[PDB]
Amino acid sequence: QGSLELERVMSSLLDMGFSNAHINELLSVRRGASLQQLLDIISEFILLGLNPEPVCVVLKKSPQLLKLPIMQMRKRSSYLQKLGLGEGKLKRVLYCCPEIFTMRQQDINDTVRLLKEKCLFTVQQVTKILHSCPSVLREDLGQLEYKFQYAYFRMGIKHPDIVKSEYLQYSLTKIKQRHIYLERLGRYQTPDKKGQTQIPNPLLKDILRVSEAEFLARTACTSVEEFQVFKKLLAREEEESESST
Amino acid sequence: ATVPRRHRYKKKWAATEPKFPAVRLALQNFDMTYSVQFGDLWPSIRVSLLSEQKYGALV
Amino acid sequence: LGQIYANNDKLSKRLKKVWKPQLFEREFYSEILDKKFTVTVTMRTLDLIDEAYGLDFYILKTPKEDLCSKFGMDLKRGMLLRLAR
Amino acid sequence: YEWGVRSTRKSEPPPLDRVYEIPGLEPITFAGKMHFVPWLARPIFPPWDRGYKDPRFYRSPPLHEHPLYKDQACYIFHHRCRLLEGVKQALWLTKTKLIEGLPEKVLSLVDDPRNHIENQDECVLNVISHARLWQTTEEIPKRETYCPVIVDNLIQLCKSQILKHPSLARRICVQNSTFSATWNRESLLLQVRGSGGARLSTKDPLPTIASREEIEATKNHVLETFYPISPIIDLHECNIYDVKNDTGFQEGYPYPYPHTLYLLDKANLRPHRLQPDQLRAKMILFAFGSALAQARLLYGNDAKVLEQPVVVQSVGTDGRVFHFLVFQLNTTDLDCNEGVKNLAWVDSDQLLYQHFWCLPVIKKRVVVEPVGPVGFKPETFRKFLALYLHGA
Amino acid sequence: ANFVSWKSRTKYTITPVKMRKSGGRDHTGRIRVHGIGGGHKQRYRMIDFLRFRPEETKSGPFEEKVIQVRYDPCRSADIALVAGGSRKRWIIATENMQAGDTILNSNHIGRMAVAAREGDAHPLGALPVGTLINNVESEPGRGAQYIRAAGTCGVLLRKVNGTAIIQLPSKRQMQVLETCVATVGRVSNVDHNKRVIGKAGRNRWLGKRPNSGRWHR
RNA sequence: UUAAUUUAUUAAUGCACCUGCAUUAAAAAUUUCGGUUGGGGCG
Ligand SMILES: [Mg+2]
Ligand SMILES: [Mg+2]
Ligand SMILES: [Mg+2]
Incomplete structure (x- = not known):
């Protein structure tokens, strides 16, 4: 019965969409787990709009993902498909942070509730947030509401421009340095009760989207040494004000 | 309705004739005049004139 | 049916408050009436059975006010009239 | 999906008092004080049965304890059943064959010029104008009032050739008599219960039209089957029934034979009327029903093929359109779907007049349609004479 | 009451x-x-x-x-x-x-796909992998609760291991066991969304009543 | 209302529902709006 047990799973997986070797490449992954346990795992992935090619990318990265049991995973699958992450939108969630199916429900629910009500995003706006930046779920809850309202009040950019420009995937370490500096240059300026004073605010391509190597030539381009004091001057400004106030 | 926690002063800033503020009335009267005699050197000094002062020792 | 304060000190706003018992529904067996009952029961009644070492015991050991229930006091009539005859 | 919501269903009983769950004692209730008391125990009352029997408060037994709850389901036709497939459904459950148009012998009786009433074009127009314009005090009569007037006044015109034909005095037109007939088809039992108006009765048999070679010629014709409609649709399913054959009369009744059946659509509403496709289906069933009432009387309750067959015709109407049918009954072994079969000659959509303007129409002061019938067809009255003179 | x-x-x-x-x-x-x-x-x-x-x-x-x-x-x-x-x-x-x-x-699930004519009722399991369904149940035996408005339809997409996810007109993929009976072929009145009712009296004949007069923010 | 005092009440979770204590909101409840220049070209 043990030899035939491999055959019927290989019969069902061949209809599912794998190859001869890629099924036999999954035999090195099953550490601890059984074969009946395996077939309920793989099906519940492919049922949520997964192709059989990206599914080995997450499982070879995360070999602990198979020990998750049967009944909690179907409740996890239903809550995420309520949120509209199914059919290929779950692929970018699974590769960058593989621990989604095992981490707890309430931290997903406290995150979506803070976005939907406290930040007043719409249902398609939360779904576009969750597809683009899945790093929002590993971030502390009080820090998430701060980085929205810093965009909402000090940066002033409205709801659709936060969601489209992938705003929530940058840290508060990075974003305080590149905002207050460009604010105090007289190159950025916050919008008014209606909007602005005289100058156009730059786009977030020129503010946030360039990396550390490409920052010094494209965004700053005034003096290389000039920002480095203000990297640490704002850091001391961060330290004393958090303790005293 | 979205309400702040800490950054309360940085919302609903008024335009010309702003009624309330004390310290940005010094700010808005520095934009025009120092843009004439300094050129593209007004951005360099404003970050220094709002961040922090370096002190010295008088032994 | 009583009243409280806000944050455990007198100088705050006064609020009303209803404390209710936690209601379990457990299944018991009466050795004297030989039927099982479906009964709304609390924590301290269950503890009052064990501290009396029996449920036929407890209905005959308490006066009226200690159980204070029309069904349980009918159980006191119903069980003890079984004993009377 | 269950029909009927909880708030409109029967209310559930209140949960029982816990006095009942102790077997030691008897409950203390308000059985003594003969009124409700909220602070006494809820009594159980015995099932109370009416000791006597009353006419205006009689309760029937349920439908498993009647004297005749036989397990085999019968299917009964009356004046209210409206068939789905129409004539094609009525053809199968009668086992009769459809021949379009009245036969040659019927239409030959009106061909002779002496067999015409005086002013056969004018006196019909006076019967139409009397019933639909001149009858009541009201301006316009509804269909529940002029429809019983047209045919029973047209009977009076067809009856006035009695001086010419003294055999016309052998007929009466009894109203409100109820016939019934039963037959079996492949398995199941089927019944007609003919409750209608104005059957016209003669004491002579009507002569057979189709020869026995024609009846032998009916073996080759197959009854046209239709599926997914079963041929039982829109008949009253009744599990409580008496298998009976009734001619509508007892023994020793003068005029024992029907001559023509005057069916009607007497409803004022078109949804409450019968369609012409459905009205001809009731023509098949009542004419077969009055004919099978005598096959079960004159020949007994045996399945055979009749040596001297019986023929009963019928006249159907709406008030504006007329339908004509002659039914020839010639077989009784109806359990088998093969062999010989009956034949009927029908007539579809045969209208007396197109429209009656009961009030003048005005279009810029000049009338375009005056009072009286519009589109009157005198040909239909010849056919309504030709059925009235058949066999006489 | x-x-x-x-x-x-x-x-x-x-x-x-x-x-x-x-x-x-x-x-x-x-x-x-x-x-x-x-x-x-x-x-x-x-x-x-x-x-x-x-x-x-x-x-x-x-x-x-x-x-x-x-x-x-x-x-x-x-x-x-x-x-x-x-x-x-x-x-x-x-x-x-x-x-x-x-x-x-x-109510039969074959080993090969079943060709739909234009209006048949079938279980979701014995249907093509991308066919265009109608009225669907949610837990087998209930009845049709879901899509029936006018020309509202969805697709069976993928069927994996005794489960068929169907697609609602709103993109809200949902999980249905593959033995719920479902009508197949596009629902009637396909030009109900292109309707213009003209007057204000058409949606007071329909039953609807005018909205309030408070300006909300 | 972004005034003060509150969260009993509804809505969520915390150590299937219920119940007992907490957290975040929604709905609200209660009470007040000093004095001296009021038209000011807005301390
Ligand atoms: Mg409106
Ligand atoms: Mg409006
Ligand atoms: Mg004063």
């Missing part, structure tokens, strides 16, 4: 039953819903949404024909008379569903 409802029949007939409209009120007489009340009178046709409802004695696959397809006042679709055997029904109609068309029911 003098709101005994007109929903009181416990026995299915095809005949139009008189509907007692509410006007937005509930059983306490309070308004919960604003903007309905008045309109042309309507009668209710009890539409049978469990299309696989097995007849008496007989069971298994069995099969139906269409009598008439008339407009439903209490719906946004076009209902049809459908009679099988000695029972006649009220069902919702598909797009090319004329009077006298050939339709079928089944």
